């Protein structure tokens, strides 16, 4: 192989997978305070594409992409989890929010507006919800770490036994979802296996952001204490 | 777009500050197609109509696709 032969199979690869970072990142911003610029994700997206590409031995298309995948993915929550995400600044406004909400529900004998909590609790709706995605990307993130326990403690017996295993977590998952209420459930269905933001979702229930914001919080917590 | 995505791929591969430059730029160009909107609405409304009107249900299953094809 002419090392420009190889220079262009590189390239040509870490190009047609450039589309992958992309949904990727775009993804993942779903789950984000609209602060965080989607260019970043990509960046730190591509990086990890490369970082792939690069330490990658041949395999098949489909396995080959598999692990494109979980290498963009990474390097991109790596990139967030270096953010304030879990800072008790953040776990403090979680409780605050908890209160506000439950005291303008008996207040009010209602769910309050999203404006109605913002204005609660002194601050914009943009502000209130841009703090609800922060929290929620906390367990968003808590809950990463579980399915990276789920691997790098049993890993160690994956190259040793070195896909269709891992279709245990898969099942594993079915177990805390069935103890997920009802509405929980219903919420997250339409959250992650819809690909959809809270704010979309509380269209589509016509509720309050910071009611389908503050219930995906709610579930994550649920399975991240069950999945732990 | 290739034409363009290429040429920086490969500029950004020859070698970081201009790389983080280069890199800043392939990103740019990466989100242009901001117009993914599609069915801004549609999947939604749908997904509604289908809510009340009994056509939508919470397979645990589902769920647990979402939660992982998201989180692997």
């Given at each position: 192989?002419?090392?420009?032969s190889?220079?262009?199979?590189?390239?040509?690869?870490?190009?047609?997978?450039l589309?992958?970072?992309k949904?990727i990142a775009?993804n993942?911003k779903?789950?984000?305070?609209?602060?965080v610029?989607?260019r970043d994700?990509?960046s730190?997206?591509?990086?990890?594409?490369?970082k792939?590409?690069?330490?990658?031995?041949?395999?098949?298309?489909?396995?080959?992409?598999?692990?494109?995948k979980?290498?963009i993915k990474?390097?991109?929550?790596?990139y967030?989890?270096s953010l304030?995400?879990?800072?008790?600044?953040?776990?403090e406004?979680?409780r605050?929010?908890?209160?506000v909400?439950?005291?303008?529900?008996?207040?009010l004998?209602?769910?309050?507006?999203?404006?109605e909590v913002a204005?609660?609790?002194?601050?914009?709706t943009?502000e209130?919800?841009?703090?609800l995605?922060?929290?929620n990307?906390?367990?968003?993130?808590?809950?990463?770490?579980?399915?990276?326990?789920?691997?790098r403690?049993?890993?160690?017996?994956?190259?040793?036994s070195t896909?269709?295993?891992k279709?245990?977590?898969?099942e594993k998952?079915?177990?805390?979802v069935?103890?997920?209420?009802?509405?929980?459930?219903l919420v997250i269905?339409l959250?992650?296996?819809e690909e959809?933001?809270?704010?979309?979702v509380?269209?589509?229930?016509?509720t309050?952001?910071?009611?389908?914001?503050q219930?995906?919080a709610?579930?994550?917590?649920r399975?991240r204490?069950?999945?732990? | 777009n290739?034409?363009?995505?290429?040429?920086?791929i490969?500029?950004?591969?020859?070698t970081?500050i201009?790389?983080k430059?280069?890199?800043?730029?392939?990103?740019?160009?990466?989100?242009?197609?901001d117009?993914?909107?599609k069915?801004?609405?549609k999947?939604?409304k749908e997904?509604?109509?289908?809510?009340?009107?009994?056509?939508?249900?919470?397979s645990?299953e589902?769920?647990?696709?979402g939660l992982?094809e998201?989180?692997?």
């Amino acid at each position: 192989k002419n090392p420009y032969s190889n220079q262009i199979e590189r390239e040509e690869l870490i190009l047609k997978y450039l589309p992958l970072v992309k949904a990727i990142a775009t993804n993942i911003k779903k789950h984000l305070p609209e602060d965080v610029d989607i260019r970043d994700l990509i960046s730190y997206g591509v990086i990890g594409l490369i970082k792939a590409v690069d330490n990658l031995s041949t395999e098949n298309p489909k396995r080959a992409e598999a692990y494109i995948k979980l290498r963009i993915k990474g390097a991109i929550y790596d990139y967030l989890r270096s953010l304030d995400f879990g800072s008790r600044q953040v776990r403090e406004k979680e409780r605050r929010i908890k209160e506000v909400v439950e005291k303008l529900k008996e207040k009010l004998g209602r769910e309050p507006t999203d404006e109605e909590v913002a204005k609660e609790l002194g601050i914009s709706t943009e502000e209130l919800f841009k703090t609800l995605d922060k929290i929620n990307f906390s367990y968003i993130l808590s809950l990463e770490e579980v399915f990276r326990d789920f691997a790098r403690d049993y890993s160690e017996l994956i190259p040793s036994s070195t896909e269709v295993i891992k279709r245990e977590l898969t099942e594993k998952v079915k177990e805390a979802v069935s103890k997920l209420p009802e509405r929980e459930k219903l919420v997250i269905q339409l959250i992650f296996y819809e690909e959809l933001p809270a704010k979309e979702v509380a269209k589509i229930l016509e509720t309050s952001v910071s009611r389908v914001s503050q219930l995906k919080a709610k579930a994550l917590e649920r399975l991240r204490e069950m999945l732990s | 777009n290739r034409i363009e995505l290429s040429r920086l791929i490969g500029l950004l591969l020859e070698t970081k500050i201009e790389d983080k430059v280069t890199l800043s730029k392939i990103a740019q160009e990466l989100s242009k197609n901001d117009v993914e909107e599609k069915d801004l609405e549609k999947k939604v409304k749908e997904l509604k109509e289908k809510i009340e009107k009994g056509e939508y249900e919470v397979s645990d299953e589902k769920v647990v696709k979402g939660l992982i094809e998201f989180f692997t």
